[PDB]
Write a protein that binds this ligand. Structure first.
Ligand SMILES: [Mg+2]
Ligand SMILES: [Mg+2]
Ligand SMILES: [Mg+2]
Ligand SMILES: [Zn+2]
Ligand SMILES: [Zn+2]
Lengths: 97, 160, 39, 146, 177, 99, 94, 38, 87
């Protein structure tokens, strides 16, 4: 009836001590999300259905505040950078795993 | 009948934290025996894969796994490509279970096997001292020795 | 936990005269003991 | 209790009153708080105890009638003032900014236009020095000044 | 987890839209927990260069509560830099002018003073009442618990706890009350 | 000169980062950082802050097991403090002695 | 072969089709996709955790920026789990 | 009112009241005794 | 030119409608907004009505110039300082 932590989000943590008392055994099986707790997946007569390719060219300003409103940032991220920094950038960075 | 020491329920008559009762020792030791045993037959059957360990080595603690690489900051008096056993295993575990030493696990319980694969030196390190208006300027270059070990295997044995 | 370690008698720094700092770091794979460490 | 009607005719009559709860845990006490073992274990939130100790119109009852000692009486008085300012007594009214732990009267304090230096800072009083001696249940004491 | 690399990175570094409520909560405690969530200091993968902030949607900002007399004592000072731009307004005046300015300024003060503060402020969303836009409501995950406990006024006590609390004193029968 | 003094600052900043990450993960488990560290020390598990943050980031089930161990050790310490007598010391409060 | 993923080494086109073929060939009911977890949704940076179930029992879960790619990642996770090419599988013995 | 740091009664009809966070001596028969604490 | 007039909801008129001078009446009071006559870059004397400096009595090349623009302790000029510009 006692649990050190709530047992319903990550794993079913059960603690134990060995008979000698020299080591601690932890058993942690994963908790699976219930089906009841889930949610189902959300779902011209005469001419072509012509593809709707309009690309309005917004000027630099209203373009930048549209991007800022879309990505919840400021304008400074979208303003450009000079040749000094652009050539200072490493275009072949090291890559681990 | 109110007990001599009863306090009426106010906002701070009782401690804010909930009352916690610990399990009785005998049933808890029996539960420990059940958990330790069942984890031991999981080890016996082999219901695990890709073990990890936390190993004390060269005054550092490394979280290593199999097929791993570590860089030790000193020479190790070993030839290249040489198999050794890391023993001071603070922690070993896998999916669904882990084992904790107090502070070290048993050598009959866990082994770590490593391979000396490189004996190199670090890139040159600058040690520079400067104090102004006193003509104080000193420069030194060091190259600390280094040893690259590859952790080959982590193996556990039924001893719980 | 230096005060607790002092109360149990296990120094204050866990790198002081423990098995964790005094047992050998490694040994050969076949079982030969390592040469003793400098520290 | 007793009450007076006006109709002219004025007349006082006696209505039913509640008595002591049967056995106090500390019968040797001399104030009700000491009798019921509540000396440092109440705050401004305990509107049951405060509404027991107040008038129907939010006023305080006298010490000689409540049976309290002086220190407990002043603590109850300050708790009742803070609860009245916090709005925890909606029925004991006389005749929007949300508050709690309000020590002074809201209409009698002046704004701190000039906070001092950090060695002589003018702080904002919170709570009551009468309730400074309450049981803490924590390892930092009550901060009475903000 | 056996995820592919790009979905695993996306899952690890994705953003969460936490919900937070005003309604008799202290603005400082609201600001503290909101600033932790906006910095991303609640994540074990936190780093200042990792851009691991999360969105915080605070509602009922008009119904905040101040401890003590801070509604009159606390003064917010600004300066329009023309000679005579020094304006000092009490917390009450600032709240009656702008209902979200107090919590906004508290979170802005608690956020770290670098160039990421305005981006975290952009990720913070504040609303004075129960109304929240539908897109934000569809974004919301995890209403966080309130720091204060709503000290529960006298008139909504139930009769069970009222008569469970013992009566402390016996009044005399000859008192007017 | 900045390179040398930043070796010193690098060690300090990595320790601060590990402390911040451990605080984050423990608060996700409802436990506080001093409670977690002190109770792991009392349980004689001498994992340092680097591997504790590493287990927090990559191995959440093992970190939840560690947090449960620390919380149980704290509860055992509270029980011993309130008992104040000669009750059994607790299963996880036992001290392994070396000689 | 050591450190690469199964669908990094063997490129597949329809993981959902492969998964339903395997489930019907080992006599398991067809998997149902459900939205286990969801953050964002109206923003440009959503997160969808889509879980694949059979007989109301979870067999896979996958993250994505859209529901469709989350579903395909869940299908790939299910294929990896059924094949034994999981990331936590027992490493090669040398 | 006269501004004082220590407040004194100069009449039997002088009374002290604490108003607006400040102590005041009010006298209805001798209004020259009106005093305000600083 | 197009100008925006703030009206209540009961004063709405259909768009595309003509409006004439008899919308007002005699004996009324109105407010008139316009762009003033631009004088270009002007000095302090024509822009702000400064007194300037005397002509004779020893003065060097200063007769229409501003004096001190700030004080010595302040190491800048205050925003909103009356100095020459477009009027
Ligand atoms: Mg002139
Ligand atoms: Mg000259
Ligand atoms: Mg001249
Ligand atoms: Zn008393
Ligand atoms: Zn007088």
């Amino acid at each position: 009836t006692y649990s050190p932590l709530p047992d319903d989000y990550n794993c079913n943590v059960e603690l134990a001590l060995t008979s000698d008392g020299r080591t601690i055994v932890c058993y942690h099986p994963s908790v699976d999300i219930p089906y009841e707790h889930t949610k189902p997946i959300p779902r011209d007569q005469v001419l072509k259905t012509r593809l709707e390719e309009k690309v309005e060219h917004l000027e630099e300003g209203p373009m930048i505040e549209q991007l800022s409103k879309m990505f919840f940032t400021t304008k400074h991220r979208w303003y450009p950078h000079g040749r000094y920094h652009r050539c200072r950038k490493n275009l072949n960075p090291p890559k681990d795993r | 009948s109110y007990l001599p020491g009863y306090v009426p329920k106010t906002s701070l008559s009782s401690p804010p934290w909930p009352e916690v009762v610990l399990p009785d020792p005998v049933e808890e030791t029996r539960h420990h025996a059940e958990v330790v045993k069942k984890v031991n037959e999981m080890i016996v059957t082999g219901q695990y894969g890709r073990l990890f360990a936390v190993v004390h080595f060269a005054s550092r603690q490394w979280k290593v796994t199999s097929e791993d690489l570590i860089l030790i900051g000193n020479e190790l008096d070993l030839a290249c490509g040489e198999r050794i056993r890391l023993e001071k295993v603070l922690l070993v575990g896998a999916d669904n279970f882990t084992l904790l030493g107090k502070p070290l696990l048993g050598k009959d319980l866990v082994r770590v096997e490593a391979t000396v694969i490189e004996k190199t030196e670090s890139w040159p390190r600058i040690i520079m001292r400067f104090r102004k208006r006193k003509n104080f300027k000193k420069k030194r270059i060091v190259t600390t020795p280094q040893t690259v070990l590859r952790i080959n295997s982590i193996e556990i044995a039924p001893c719980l | 936990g230096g005060q607790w370690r002092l109360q149990q008698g296990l120094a204050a720094n866990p790198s002081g005269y423990g098995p964790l700092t005094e047992l050998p770091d490694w040994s050969y794979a076949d079982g030969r003991p390592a040469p003793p460490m400098k520290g | 209790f007793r009450e007076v009607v006006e109709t002219t005719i004025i007349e006082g009559r006696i209505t039913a009153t509640p008595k002591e709860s049967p056995n106090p845990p500390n019968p040797s006490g001399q104030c009700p708080i000491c009798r019921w073992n509540l000396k440092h274990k109440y705050n401004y939130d305990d509107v049951l105890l405060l509404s027991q100790f107040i008038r129907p119109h939010g006023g305080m009852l006298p010490r000689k009638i409540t049976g309290l000692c002086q220190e407990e009486h002043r603590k109850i008085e300050e708790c009742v003032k803070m609860a009245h300012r916090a709005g925890l007594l909606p029925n004991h009214r006389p005749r929007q900014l949300n508050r709690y732990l309000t020590r002074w009267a809201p209409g009698s304090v002046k704004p701190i236009y000039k906070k001092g230096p950090r060695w002589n800072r003018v702080r904002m009083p919170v709570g009551s020095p009468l309730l400074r001696d309450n049981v803490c249940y924590s390892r930092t004491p009550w901060k009475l000044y903000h | 987890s056996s995820f592919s690399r790009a979905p695993q990175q996306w899952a690890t570094f994705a953003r969460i839209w936490y919900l937070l409520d005003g309604k008799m909560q202290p603005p400082g405690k609201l600001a503290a927990m909101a600033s932790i969530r906006l910095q991303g200091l609640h994540k074990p993968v936190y780093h200042a260069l990792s851009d691991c902030g999360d969105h915080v949607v605070i509602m009922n900002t008009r119904h905040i509560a101040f401890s003590g007399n801070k509604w009159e004592q606390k003064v917010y000072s600004s300066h329009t830099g023309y000679p005579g731009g020094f304006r000092q307004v009490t917390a009450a005046q600032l709240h009656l002018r702008d209902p979200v300015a107090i919590v906004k300024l508290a979170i802005y003060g608690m956020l770290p003073k670098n160039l990421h503060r305005r981006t975290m402020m952009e990720r913070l969303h504040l609303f004075p009442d129960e109304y929240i836009p539908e897109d934000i409501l569809k974004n919301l995950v995890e209403e966080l618990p309130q720091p204060r406990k709503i000290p529960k006024r006298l008139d909504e006590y139930t009769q069970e706890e009222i008569d469970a609390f013992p009566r402390l004193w016996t009044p005399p029968e000859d008192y007017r009350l | 000169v900045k390179c040398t003094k930043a070796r010193y600052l690098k060690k300090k900043n990595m320790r601060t980062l590990w402390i911040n990450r451990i605080t984050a993960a423990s608060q996700e488990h409802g436990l506080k950082y001093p409670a977690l560290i002190g109770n792991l020390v009392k349980c004689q598990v001498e994992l340092n802050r680097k591997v504790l943050a590493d287990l927090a980031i990559y191995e959440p089930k093992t970190f939840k097991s560690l947090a449960a161990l620390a919380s149980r050790r704290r509860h055992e310490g509270f029980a011993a403090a309130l008992g104040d007598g000669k009750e059994p010391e607790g299963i996880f409060s036992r001290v392994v002695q070396y000689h | 072969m050591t450190g690469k993923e199964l669908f990094e080494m063997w490129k597949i086109i329809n993981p959902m089709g492969l998964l339903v073929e395997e489930l019907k060939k080992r006599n398991v009911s067809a998997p149902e996709s459900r939205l286990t977890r969801q953050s964002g949704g109206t923003t440009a940076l959503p997160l969808y955790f889509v879980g694949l179930y059979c007989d109301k029992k979870l067999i896979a879960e996958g993250p994505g920026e859209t529901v469709l790619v989350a579903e395909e990642e869940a299908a790939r996770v299910a294929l990896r789990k059924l094949y034994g090419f999981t990331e936590n599988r027992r490493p090669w013995n040398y | 009112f006269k501004n004082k740091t220590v407040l004194k009664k100069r009449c039997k009809d002088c009374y002290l009241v604490k108003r607006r966070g400040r102590w005041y001596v009010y006298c209805k028969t001798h209004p020259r005794h009106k005093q305000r604490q600083m | 030119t197009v100008k925006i007039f703030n009206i209540t909801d009961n004063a709405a008129i259909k768009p595309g409608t003509p409006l004439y001078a008899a919308h007002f009446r005699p004996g009324q009071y109105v407010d008139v907004t316009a762009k003033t006559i631009g004088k270009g870059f002007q000095g302090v004397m024509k822009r702000w009505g400064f007194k300037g400096q005397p002509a004779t009595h020893g003065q060097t090349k200063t007769h229409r110039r501003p004096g001190a623009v700030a004080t010595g302790d302040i190491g800048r000029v205050w925003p909103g300082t009356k100095m020459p510009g477009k009027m």
